[PDB]
Amino acid sequence: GIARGRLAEERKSWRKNHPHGFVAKPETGQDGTVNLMVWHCTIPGKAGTDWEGGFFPLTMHFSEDYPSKPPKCKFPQGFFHPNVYPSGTVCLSILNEDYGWRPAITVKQILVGIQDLLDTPNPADPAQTDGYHLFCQDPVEYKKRVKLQSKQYPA
Amino acid sequence: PLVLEINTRKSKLRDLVDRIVKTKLGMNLPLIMHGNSLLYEVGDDLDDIMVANYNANLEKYLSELPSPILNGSILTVEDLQQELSCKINVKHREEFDEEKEPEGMVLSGWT
């Protein structure tokens, strides 16, 4: 019951106040169930960046051990970013159970942390060779890839 | 922990929301949960797919909700704005007195 109670709190908190352009909501199944353990989210790219105008889908998977353990956050498979695996998994220090996670971190803080990561990748956390290479050795090709991807995710 | 006696096969989610949650518990923006699943939410912030699904749930018998409410089910009810929060123990009952229990259900443990 600890996980459910905390997710119910996060649900209310999110609905009453969240940053503009973001979406975060429990998944509705084809059977009508609404699942507090799996949330579908949308992270806007920041204005004034190559991510601008993109609205990027992300799924947050909580466990019965939340909030002792962090959710798993996934962009779509093949999403282009140096810190995102091919599977879509996002690498973020605060999502790391071994070191950065603390139970008090909110869903809002996670999604803002991911939004920040989009235009400011972490050079120590390379997850995919494609993004990471272009980022490190060919910024012009990287920039073109990012802007093309933003166009794939309009509001 | 309140006790709700109710015919789970014949009463609809709507009956519980209107007669218990809104009327007796005084919750105007309720979130109703059964385990990890949300059975109902209300508000102008919900997207049209979620509202359409919640609208469909209102018209379902309790025992036929996507997460079925049966004898011994425990519901959790929270309100979006007010600090009110309740657990409700559901006890199935077949029949109710037509003039003493005219709402077709009985809430015990409530002030």
Swiss-Prot record, chain A:
Biological processes annotated in GO: embryo development ending in seed dormancy; protein sumoylation; response to abscisic acid
Phenotype of gene-disrupted mutants: Embryonic lethal.
Domain UBC core intervals: 2-155
GO cellular component: cytosol; nucleus
Domain of life assignment: Eukaryota
Active-site residues, as the UniProt record annotates them: C91 (glycyl thioester intermediate)
EC number: 2.3.2.-
Pathway: Protein modification; protein sumoylation
Sorted UniProt keywords: Acetylation, ATP-binding, Nucleotide-binding, Transferase, Ubl conjugation pathway
Gene3D superfamilies documented for this protein: Ubiquitin Conjugating Enzyme (3.10.110.10)
Enzyme class label: transferase
GO molecular function per UniProt: ATP binding; kinase binding; SUMO binding; SUMO transferase activity
Keyword Transferase belongs to the record: yes
Quaternary assembly: Interacts with SIZ1 (via PHD domain) and MMS21. Interacts with TCP14 and TCP15. Interacts with KIN10.
PANTHER family xrefs: UBIQUITIN-CONJUGATING ENZYME E2
Function: SUMO-conjugating enzyme that accepts the SUMO proteins from the E1 SUMO-activating heterodimer SAE1/SAE2 and catalyzes its covalent attachment to other proteins with the E3 SUMO ligases SIZ1 and MMS21. Associates with SIZ1 for sumoylation of the transcription factor GTE3.
Similarity remark: Belongs to the ubiquitin-conjugating enzyme family.
Protein name as it appears in the record: SUMO-conjugating enzyme SCE1
Source organism of the structure: Arabidopsis thaliana (Mouse-ear cress)
